[PDB]
């Protein structure tokens with residue numbers, strides 16, 4: 001490959017040096033007698049100045065016709081100039097047009113288009129600066145998680161996606177034909193992580209999870225990226241400490257590295273800056289009282305839906321925990337509160353500013369008889385869970401874990417109006433394509 | 435959480451210090467008047483010495499009954515002793531039996547069991563030392579890949595799993611009902627990575643890929659982990675350089691960190707040590723000649739199946755490339771060799787010692803008309819690929835990429851007898867459970 005110079009490298013200190021740019025036309029404007037092509041690549045935008053008496057009539061005429069997203073190679077000499085973007089421009093000596101484009105279907109400001117058009121052309125939308133900024137934020141949050149997980153001594157595992165058991169209820173399970181049988185798409189790797197702690201003690205995975213959720217909200221995808229941890233020996237309170245340390249590190253590391261991208265989306269970084277341990281903790285009981293005090297018609301035992309969570313977040317300026325939920329609005333695998341068996345040792349972590357749940361976790365039931373009884377009570381077939389019950393037969397230990405919704409976290413960090421914008425190619429009940 | 439001391443931390447320098455172990459009984463033997471419990475955790479095995487006159491009759495009797503995989507907490511004093519494992523043992527003061535076990539269904543040497551029994555109890559098999567060693571190797575290879583990818587400036591993305599297009603042929607596609615429509619499970623994220631290079635230039639993903647492969651070989655899973663890279667500007671020769679640099683780094687970093695685990699599986703590390711650039715490169719033409727010279731009944735134009743690849747590997751002592759395949763045994767998206775349009779600019783990387791293909795990659799067709807013609811020739815519906823064709827309409831650039839099978843790589847590194855042992859919970863046509 002003939003090596004290129006990235007746009008971000010075009011700096012005043014390169015004055016007088018030859019560079020080869022490779023990228024796509026961002027804008028094309030005549031300035032005086034010259035053509036100014038702003039060329040974008042994955043690192044920035046550089047002004048390339050095309051002069052007729054330097055490149056010749058043929059090249060000059062070709063340059064006039066280059067619309068947005070035309071692919072080009074540009075060779076020229078860097079000139080330091082304070083008026084130019086980045087303080088330096090390229091005086092073009094050679095222009096190779098790879099493909100001229102004049103009708104790119106995403107507008108220069110994509111948010112002047114209908115969101116439905118942007119989704120119809122999602123494969124083109126992702127190359128635009130704001131959409132790409134979201135993907136850089138997403139990769140940085142995940143990089144940060146892996147740094148924290150490595151340092152704190154967790155083992156990464158690669159759990160199955162094709163499964164035979166519901167983790168989070170049958171209502172949101174995708175079913176498929178699998179040769180001579182049927183399989184489901186995993187809603188969560190949790191049960192497999194619970195198997196893995198017996199060999200590795202502290203484990204995590206990052207997997208796509210699948211939820212056949214009919215409701216078309218701004219917080220639900222049918223496919224999402226799910227960062228899950230499970231640990232031997234830890235109780236609910238221990239796992240909550242892990243959650244706040246991990247999320248704080250993810251957010252602070254991403255503030256450190258991606259300030260520029262975040263400032264494209266936020267006028268106020270306060271809640272992100274506030275994201276350090278210890279996070280506020282309220283009981284579900286306290287949540288109900290806060291909600292009732294603000295006029296919300298909620299009764300103890302009711303689920304906290306998105307609208308309840310929204311009002312609740314008004315009282316907080318950073319992520320916070322709600323803990324100790326009524327048993328029967330939570331999943332079958334959760335350990336009862338030994339002080340009050342009406343409740344389970346569950347906690348959710350909610351983001352402020354209306355975003356609501358980003359993590360769901362719990363301490364797991366570690367008693368065989370109790371777990372089996374709960375499976376039966378929920379109308380589940382113990383045969384589908386025999387292997388999971390085995391974990392309570394062959395050296396059971398107390399353990400806890402949780403799952404983080406990566407897109408939910410990205411949506412809060414960037415104050416997105418819909419979770420879909422945090423997925424490279426979002427999947428929702430009416431959207432499968434591109 | 436009351437803090438524990440990991441088995442690996444029990445060292446002679448801790449002589450006289452109190453420790454709290456937490457783990458599972460590995461062996462239980464009476465030695466003289468005492469009970470020696472070897473306790474395993476995720477980091478090793480420590481000898482815990484239980485003396486009747488120290489712990490009392492009740493505890494001593496409980497200790498006698500602890501079989502393999504009994505879960506225990508042990509508090510005691512470290513004593514340096516050269517006869518003990520790791521040069522140090524724990525003199526037990528307190529033993530808490532969490533759950534006594536006597537009938538763990540995996541034998542102490544698992545390979546004395548039928549592989550079918552181990553798979554039936556896969557959730558228990560994964561906690562055993564060899565199986566856990568495979569998972570530590572797998573996580574280290576992947577950690578190494580991410581280190582290399584970060585340093586070399588690639589962006590991580592999170593592509594879709596629910597899709598509408600075959601990347602690697604319709605024969606191995608899983609189909610499912612998706613609300614009012616149908617979806618497929620991704621065979622490969624490649625086409626989406628190709629969209630993403632227009633914004634990010636150099637991208638990668640690690641995703642589960644799904645292949646409805648009926649043939650029950652030792653090299654095929656129906657679900658596998660797929661590390662894929664795609665890069666603007668790079669041709670086939672460029673991407674081959676990336677492949678050998680990445681794989682060499684993965685293997686060398688894993689040799690550095692996981693020598694102990696690898697030596698559980700290999701008597702000879704030579705081929706791993708040999709894995710540094712430049713890898714040998716032979717053309718498909720050369721491969722055919724080598725094969726014909728060794729008596730293999732292969733004709734130019736024929737696919738190189740697993741048995742052909744096996745014989746071919748005999749001539750190599752490290753991974754190697756085969757390049758320049760006949761067009762019609764390769765996928766629709768591959769760029770024709772401009773010097774010889776009977777061929778495409780494809781290469782596979784084969785592991786030695788009979789393992790065969792670990793990477794499939796190519797330069798991609800970047801001309802709209804050629805790609806459309808190929809889609810039509812293969813009986814594919816251009817409507818399902820309109821968005822992919824769009825990438826050749828809106829600023830097309832030359833580009834190349836590849837996919838690495840993580841389990842295939844692990845199987846070669848550890849000289850496994852079947853790829854299934856490299857998956858946490860393997861999926862094959864007859865195996866969906868646990």
Ligand SMILES: NC(=O)C[C@H]([NH3+])C(=O)OP(=O)(O)OC[C@H]1O[C@@H](n2cnc3c(N)ncnc32)[C@H](O)[C@@H]1O
Pocket residue numbers: 167168187188189190211213219220221222223224226228229357358359360361362401402403404405406407408419
């Ligand atoms: N390992 C565990 O303990 C996780 C547990 N088994 C679990 O699946 O919990 P959830 O609360 O359903 O999901 C966990 C998180 O996953 C996200 N999530 C859950 N459903 C989601 C959906 N339909 N779309 C997008 N994100 C979704 C939310 O952030 C939620 O807090």
Ligand SMILES: NC(=O)C[C@H]([NH3+])C(=O)OP(=O)(O)OC[C@H]1O[C@@H](n2cnc3c(N)ncnc32)[C@H](O)[C@@H]1O
Pocket residue numbers: 601602621622623624645647653654655656657658660662663791792793794795796835836837838839840841842853
């Ligand atoms: N991004 C790309 O260019 C990849 C390309 N779209 C692709 O899917 O190529 P394959 O050669 O089919 O698969 C790539 C690798 O994926 C692995 N693989 C492919 N099929 C596999 C299977 N059924 N089981 C286990 N591993 C399998 C093999 O290592 C193979 O070399």
Ligand SMILES: [Mg+2]
Pocket residue numbers: 348357359360
């Ligand atoms: Mg939840």
Ligand SMILES: [Mg+2]
Pocket residue numbers: 782791793794
């Ligand atoms: Mg292949």
